[PDB]
Amino acid sequence: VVDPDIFNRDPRDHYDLLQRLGGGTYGEVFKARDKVSGDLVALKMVKMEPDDDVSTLQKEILILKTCRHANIVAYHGSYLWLQKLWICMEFCGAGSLQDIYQVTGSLSELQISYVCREVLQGLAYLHSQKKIHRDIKGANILINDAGEVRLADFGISAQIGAELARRLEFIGTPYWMAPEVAAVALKGGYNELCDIWSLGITAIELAELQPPLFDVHPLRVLFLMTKSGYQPPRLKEKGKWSAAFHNFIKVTLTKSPKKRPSATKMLSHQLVSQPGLNRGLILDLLDKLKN
Numbered sequence: 702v703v704d705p706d707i708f709n710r711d712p713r714d715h716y717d718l719l720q721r722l723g724g725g726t727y728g729e730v731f732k733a734r735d736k737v738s739g740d741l742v743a744l745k746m747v748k749m750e751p752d753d754d755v756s757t758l759q760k761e762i763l764i765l766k767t768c769r770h771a772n773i774v775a776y777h778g779s780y781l782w783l784q785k786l787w788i789c790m791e792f793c794g795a796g797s798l799q800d801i802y803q804v805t806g807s808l809s810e811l812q813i814s815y816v817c818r819e820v821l822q823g824l825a826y827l828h829s830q831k832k833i834h835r836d837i838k839g840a841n842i843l844i845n846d847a848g849e850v851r852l853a854d855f856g857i858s859a860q861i862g863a864e865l866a867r868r869l870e871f872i873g874t875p876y877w878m879a880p881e882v883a884a885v886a887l888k889g890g891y892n893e894l895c896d897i898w899s900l901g902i903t904a905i906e907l908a909e910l911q912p913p914l915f916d917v918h919p920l921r922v923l924f925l926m927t928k929s930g931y932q933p934p935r936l937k938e939k940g941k942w943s944a945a946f947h948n949f950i951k952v953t954l955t956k957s958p959k960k961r962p963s964a965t966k967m968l969s970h971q972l973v974s975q976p977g978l979n980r981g982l983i984l985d986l987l988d989k990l991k992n
């Protein structure tokens with residue numbers, strides 16, 4: 702079973718499908734309208750045939766149905782019908798920040814500051830549940846028509862959680878195993894502070910339209926990050942950005958996780974605690990998008 706609370710019902714008994722969303726980047730996703738209330742939702746459809754391995758989807762639904770926070774895209778339930786699984790989600794009408802900056806160009810520092818504050822609020826919540834997103838990036842920060850910010854897509858988190866469960870299942874007799882081997886098997890080898898680093902990279906992405914080293918082969922990037930002398934990335938255009946933004950990048954991109962600030966701590970940083978950060982900043986961005 703993929704989840705004990707799935708609705709065994711055709712979602713089209715409750716919703717009218719209106720438009721495909723995401724260009725396929727996120728799978729088969731449909732804008733849909735509640736037949737009763739008229740509210741809009743996003744329905745993601747995934748194949749779920751009787752013999753398929755459902756462990757990762759099981760974990761993703763378990764994450765979704767235990768999150769309830771304004772800055773996390775809302776989960777409304779899942780439908781299993783004729784071997785298709787539909788996940789019903791809050792609809793974010795402006796798409797992801799990547800969809801937006803590909804049209805508008807780089808965000809303003811204030812716009813990035815608001816986005817970062819809202820994401821950190823979602824992360825603080827997730828981390829208070831001992832959850833890790835593990836895939837923070839512009840493509841997974843969604844914007845609704847009101848200019849509000851929603852973290853989305855726990856697919857990677859689900860894949861990781863499912864992998865940990867499987868390795869635990871087959872870890873075998875432990876009596877000769879070193880503690881660090883057991884720890885990696887039970888806990889994964891890292892912690893939630895990886896999300897803080899990814900948010901730092903995301904801030905550069907919103908500022909420059911590419912993450913650092915985007916034009917370097919991925920395997921080379923992975924190897925470089927493991928060298929003892931690896932240097933955290935920086936914003937390239939020094940004069941475009943305030944000292945507070947440069948420092949925000951410096952502290953989020955602390956390479957030792959034992960020294961990297963938590964989400965709650967980062968929320969006290971000058972860049973994200975300054976006044977004037979509200980959704981009007983993103984409505985400005987969406988107005989630029991419209992022109």
Ligand SMILES: Cn1cccc(-c2cccc(-c3cnc4c(c3Cl)[C@]3(CC[C@](C)(C(N)=O)C3)CN4)c2)c1=O
Binds near residue numbers: 723774800
């Ligand atoms: C043509 N057009 C018009 C308007 C908006 C878009 C558009 C573009 C990119 C993203 C989205 C989007 C909005 N809201 C959403 C989701 C998504 Cl993909 C998810 C469902 C699953 C999900 C992956 C998750 N795991 O949360 C994200 C559910 N909430 C919409 C568009 O393309």
